[PDB]
Amino acid sequence: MEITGPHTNTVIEWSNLINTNTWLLYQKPLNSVRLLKHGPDTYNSNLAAFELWYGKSGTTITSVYYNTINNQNKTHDANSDCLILFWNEGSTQLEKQVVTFNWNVGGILIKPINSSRMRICMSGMENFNNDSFNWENWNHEFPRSNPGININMYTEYFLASS
């Protein structure tokens, strides 16, 4: 496992994700912050897209890419330190995948399904109903949003692959 960082490049080329599993990893930020986005410059409901944030407990996270949408899921009131993936794909207009940030590093895992499709994976330990607990282990497949669209990186990040 090669682990490199902190990288400060603002773009990860889609072509660098197609041959192996890639972890995008972040030291726990001190406040809510947008981490990355895959999608066009302006929201386009016909294309798949996602936008990843870190959310600090007790704060409100408002999507940038989805700010021109009308949907309950365009914001998240964080009740734990967490990762928040705003995403749309297929018939799904907008959902948010939230996992709790349990350690001093967290992020997402990208598994290439083919040269134009990625599986985004997120996991974390959460509580609900007070003292009920769940290991959330989630994934969704995304086609490349459109030709030439890469991954915008908004904060320094670590890269893990084999």
Closest by Cα among 85, 134, 125, 121 to 103: 125
Residue with the two structure tokens 């408002």: 62
Q: CB of 78 within 8 A of CB of 57?
A: yes
Angle subtended at Cα 152 by Cα 96 and Cα 79, rounded to the nearest 5 degrees: 30
Please name the helix (run of DSSP H) or strand (run of DSSP E) that holds residue 161, with its range, or none: strand 157-161
- Taking each continuous run of H as one helix and of E as one strand, the counts in the chain are 0, 14
* Cα–Cα distance for residue pair 49/43, rounded to 1 Å: 9
Separation between Cα atoms, residue 109 and residue 114, nearest integer Å: 15
**Is 153:17 a contact under the CB 8 Å cutoff?**
no
Q: How was this structure determined?
A: X-ray
Angle, CA 87 vertex, CA 82 and CA 90 arms, to 5°: 150
> Exposure of 51 by Cβ count < 10 A (0-12 exposed, 13-18 middle, 19+ buried)?
buried
User: How many other CB atoms sit within 10 Å of the CB of residue 97?
Assistant: 19
Task: Give the Cα separation of 152 and 98 in Å (integer).
Answer: 20
Cα-atom radius of gyration of the chain, to the nearest Å? 15
For 48, residues 6+ apart whose C-beta sits below 8 A from its C-beta are 39, 87, 88, 89, 90, 142, 143, 145
For residue 102, which of 77, 61, 134 has the smallest C-alpha distance?
134
**Any idea of the CA torsion for 75, 79, 82, 88, to the nearest 10 degrees?**
-30
136, 114 Cβ separation under 8 angstroms: no
Do residues 121 and 138 make contact, with C-beta atoms less than 8 angstroms apart? yes
Amino acid found at 38 = H
Backbone phi and psi for residue 79, each to the nearest 5 degrees, phi listed first: -105, 10
How many angstroms separate the Cα of 94 from the Cα of each of 28, 47, 121, 143, 157?
26, 12, 17, 16, 26
Resolution in A: 1.8
Give the angle subtended at the CA of 134 by the CAs of 62 and 99, to the nearest 5°: 25
